[PDB]
Amino acid sequence: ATYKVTLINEAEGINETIDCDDDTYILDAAEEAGLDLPYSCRAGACSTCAGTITSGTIDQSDQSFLDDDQIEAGYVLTCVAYPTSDCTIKTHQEEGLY
Ligand code: FES
């Protein structure tokens, strides 16, 4: 394991702290753990799984849907994200997306 990634959307209950590695897509790291987050496509071709990495670093790469401005303003498409350090994420941001 390597990274402790905390996941919160205070108003949704989720306020767990999970261990992830720099090779586990945060989405899966969170589902091993038993809290069940958002996802549809599981491939960077959408937005349902979106979060805003409050502080820290991630690698999206794999993403096909978020455009630059959206990634500069904190949007993470969790499902295909690998943690790059420790990071706290807000779990559900699609209503607010664009
Ligand atoms: S579930 Fe569609 S990009 Fe994450």
From Swiss-Prot:
Keywords: 2Fe-2S, Electron transport, Iron, Iron-sulfur, Metal-binding, Transport. The lineage of its organism: Bacteria, Bacillati, Cyanobacteriota, Cyanophyceae, Oscillatoriophycideae. GO terms for molecular function: 2 iron, 2 sulfur cluster binding; electron transfer activity; metal ion binding. InterPro entries: 2Fe-2S_ferredoxin-like_sf (IPR036010), 2Fe-2S_ferredoxin-type (IPR001041), 2Fe2S_fd_BS (IPR006058), Beta-grasp_dom_sf (IPR012675), Fd_pln (IPR010241). Its cofactor is [2Fe-2S] cluster. One of its GO terms (biological process) is electron transport chain. Belongs to the 2Fe2S plant-type ferredoxin family. Ferredoxins are iron-sulfur proteins that transfer electrons in a wide variety of metabolic reactions. [2Fe-2S] cluster binds at residues 41, 46, 49, 79. This is Ferredoxin. Residues 3-95 form the 2Fe-2S ferredoxin-type domain. PANTHER family: FERREDOXIN (PTHR43112), FERREDOXIN-2, CHLOROPLASTIC (PTHR43112:SF3). Pfam families: Fer2. Binds 1 [2Fe-2S] cluster.
